[PDB]
Enzyme design. Sequence first.
Site, PDB file in Angstrom:
ATOM      1  N   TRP A 116       0.948  -1.263   0.122  1.00  0.00           N
ATOM      2  CA  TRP A 116       0.138   0.038   0.196  1.00  0.00           C
ATOM      3  C   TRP A 116       0.888   1.282   0.093  1.00  0.00           C
ATOM      4  O   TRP A 116       0.409   2.425   0.503  1.00  0.00           O
ATOM      5  CB  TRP A 116      -1.007  -0.269   1.231  1.00  0.00           C
ATOM      6  CG  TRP A 116      -2.138  -0.954   0.956  1.00  0.00           C
ATOM      7  CD1 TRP A 116      -2.041  -2.360   1.718  1.00  0.00           C
ATOM      8  CD2 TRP A 116      -3.113  -1.233  -0.016  1.00  0.00           C
ATOM      9  NE1 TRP A 116      -2.908  -2.979   1.363  1.00  0.00           N
ATOM     10  CE2 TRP A 116      -3.727  -2.549   0.381  1.00  0.00           C
ATOM     11  CE3 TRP A 116      -3.544  -0.303  -1.116  1.00  0.00           C
ATOM     12  CZ2 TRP A 116      -4.887  -2.988  -0.293  1.00  0.00           C
ATOM     13  CZ3 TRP A 116      -4.918  -0.749  -1.352  1.00  0.00           C
ATOM     14  CH2 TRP A 116      -5.449  -2.072  -1.381  1.00  0.00           C
TER      15      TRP A 116
ATOM     16  N   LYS B 133      -5.776   0.026  -5.354  1.00  0.00           N
ATOM     17  CA  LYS B 133      -6.191   1.349  -5.415  1.00  0.00           C
ATOM     18  C   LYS B 133      -5.575   2.403  -6.209  1.00  0.00           C
ATOM     19  O   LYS B 133      -4.341   2.201  -6.375  1.00  0.00           O
ATOM     20  CB  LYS B 133      -6.467   1.703  -4.068  1.00  0.00           C
ATOM     21  CG  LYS B 133      -7.714   1.148  -3.375  1.00  0.00           C
ATOM     22  CD  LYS B 133      -8.034   1.859  -1.672  1.00  0.00           C
ATOM     23  CE  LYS B 133      -9.060   1.158  -1.281  1.00  0.00           C
ATOM     24  NZ  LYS B 133      -9.444   1.447   0.103  1.00  0.00           N
TER      25      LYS B 133
ATOM     26  N   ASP C 279     -31.720   0.018 -18.201  1.00  0.00           N
ATOM     27  CA  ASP C 279     -32.711   0.549 -17.087  1.00  0.00           C
ATOM     28  C   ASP C 279     -32.406   2.146 -17.153  1.00  0.00           C
ATOM     29  O   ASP C 279     -31.513   2.929 -17.180  1.00  0.00           O
ATOM     30  CB  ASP C 279     -32.053   0.173 -16.129  1.00  0.00           C
ATOM     31  CG  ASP C 279     -32.173  -1.260 -15.798  1.00  0.00           C
ATOM     32  OD1 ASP C 279     -33.211  -1.916 -16.582  1.00  0.00           O
ATOM     33  OD2 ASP C 279     -31.646  -2.146 -15.015  1.00  0.00           O
TER      34      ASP C 279
ATOM     35  N   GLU D  21     -36.209   0.551 -20.904  1.00  0.00           N
ATOM     36  CA  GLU D  21     -37.088   0.591 -19.766  1.00  0.00           C
ATOM     37  C   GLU D  21     -37.616   2.255 -19.761  1.00  0.00           C
ATOM     38  O   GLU D  21     -36.951   3.041 -19.437  1.00  0.00           O
ATOM     39  CB  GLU D  21     -36.495   0.254 -18.398  1.00  0.00           C
ATOM     40  CG  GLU D  21     -37.529   0.497 -17.470  1.00  0.00           C
ATOM     41  CD  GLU D  21     -36.831   0.560 -15.977  1.00  0.00           C
ATOM     42  OE1 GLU D  21     -35.644   1.060 -15.959  1.00  0.00           O
ATOM     43  OE2 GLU D  21     -37.338   0.196 -15.051  1.00  0.00           O
TER      44      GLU D  21
END
Length: 675
Positions: free
Chosen positions: A83, A118, A339, A394
Amino acid sequence: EEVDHLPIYDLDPKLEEFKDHFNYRIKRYLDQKCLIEKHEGGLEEFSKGYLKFGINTVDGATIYREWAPAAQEAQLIGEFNNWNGAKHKMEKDKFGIWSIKISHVNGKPAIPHNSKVKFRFRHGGGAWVDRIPAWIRYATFDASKFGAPYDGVHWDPPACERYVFKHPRPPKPDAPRIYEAHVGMSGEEPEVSTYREFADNVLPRIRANNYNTVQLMAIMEHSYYASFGYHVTNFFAVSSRSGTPEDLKYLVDKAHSLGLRVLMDVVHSHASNNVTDGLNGYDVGQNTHESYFHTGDRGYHKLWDSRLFNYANWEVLRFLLSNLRYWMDEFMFDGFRFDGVTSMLYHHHGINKGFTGNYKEYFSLDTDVDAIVYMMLANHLMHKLLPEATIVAEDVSGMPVLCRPVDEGGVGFDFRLAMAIPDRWIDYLKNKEDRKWSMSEIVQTLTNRRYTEKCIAYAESHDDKTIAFLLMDKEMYTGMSDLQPASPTINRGIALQKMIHFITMALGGDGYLNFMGNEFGHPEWIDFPREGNNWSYDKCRRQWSLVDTDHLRYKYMNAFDQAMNALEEEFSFLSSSKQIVSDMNEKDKVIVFERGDLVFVFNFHPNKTYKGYKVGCDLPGKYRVALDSDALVFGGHGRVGHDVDHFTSPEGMNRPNSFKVLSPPRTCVAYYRVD
């Protein structure tokens, strides 16, 4: 030049009034497509973004790229460098794309498969900001403190840990018969069920009920389970709570092995506002040109408490268009449902509206041409990659040409959902006594649609009380046991559930949808673990035991659903343009119609039996029962003879022929002509 007369104008003459809008729209599409071809080698090439962004192995090296123009410094951090990203600093190109090339060590990739990573960046001279890479393909959470929070996971399994697809995509059916499902809540147990459990246990049931398509919800990663998959955090990640990306491939391959097509819910209408786990973590106050999202009001969806994409941004188009190819190519989907298309189509997002059908509401300054250009490019791309793909929209608004091809001037969708149908059933079941039901009003709801465009009909979908529960309520907990004769309320509810489903299918559209559990009249409602219910999993599951138990009556509703889908498979009525409503009898509560080669007779009257009821038909000859809701196998009373011949009499010199039927109360019977 050719944009002067779009094919859509010949299809609907009213459209030419809005030539100015379509001029602007189509030219915006053409311009954007030209830019992509000029700078990125075309849509097919541009949509291979996931081979360029995120973490990718190249010869002797690993390349990681991340678009973050607002950052001044950036590093890649993870378990692989404890990290600490000091030796894994990234460089920023002129377009604001950060890159790093990491040499292999002894021919081994520097970032181990299934290890956490990350994107670490600094903005405005502040502290390090650590986010999950936007193109991450897997993200996990530890169920200890927070949730969560989520960790981005480098997913690159070695050969023996990869799932390899064994089966081909099945062909496109003549009509989609869709079983809509959510993996997490698909198990009997009050827990998050898994992809493999769904594949092994639920897929066979879907096939047994004669569905030909699965609509798979909640695949794109979402930190908030109760969002039903709608609030997406990691767009390239298979939701980890039900398994790994390899577990999903297993599911899709198994569906394919059973001859079922699989569509995925694509949520490109918005993004989660979750700062730590999702895309919103990349907004540090920069201009919209340097963000995934618009700024100010345009950047925020009040209703969904979510962020809204800037569809004109180059990198947003790369991201979304590549996302479509990612799901299609990597996971072998046969198509998608987009959607929240209504929200995408208008700047007001259709929130608490209100649509009258007036074309002024469809083609105006409220029309989001940015989003429409994206959807056009999307549909052009997808149908190029997979000509037989089915893409569903949709959209509640009824937007014209939403479901016409891009080459005609349309948005390019294959089907829209018939979203007005469930509202009619809800109002009727909740608010209107059976005797006040209007037959014409039912027919209007089912038939008042655009006939130049295809739609998928459904009597109910997720979002709460089911049709069966509106019909029968508390009585289901005791009355569904076959150990006592059915009460009047149980008899009514079972009868009407079959009838509501059947008329919705036969009259409502060019395809059919059913949400998991509703095929057998699953009781109660769906409720996810929320703060407002103290994180309960009680209604976040499916009680398969109800349909599997022979001493219960759910099997009767299930058997009818199976037979209804089988009837469609045999006669192909969904893909027929022959649709004639010949009788709307208000006094007698009877609806008679023809769809394809079948004559349908619906008796909504509570108690009256009609002997020798005259029904109109096209072809003369000999008619018999094709499907009878009153059959004992469907829990009926067996009043309709299946072996009974119904000979036609001539009419005229408003149907050309007619025959006579027996029609008991609360029954629906389909009749076919004997060859």
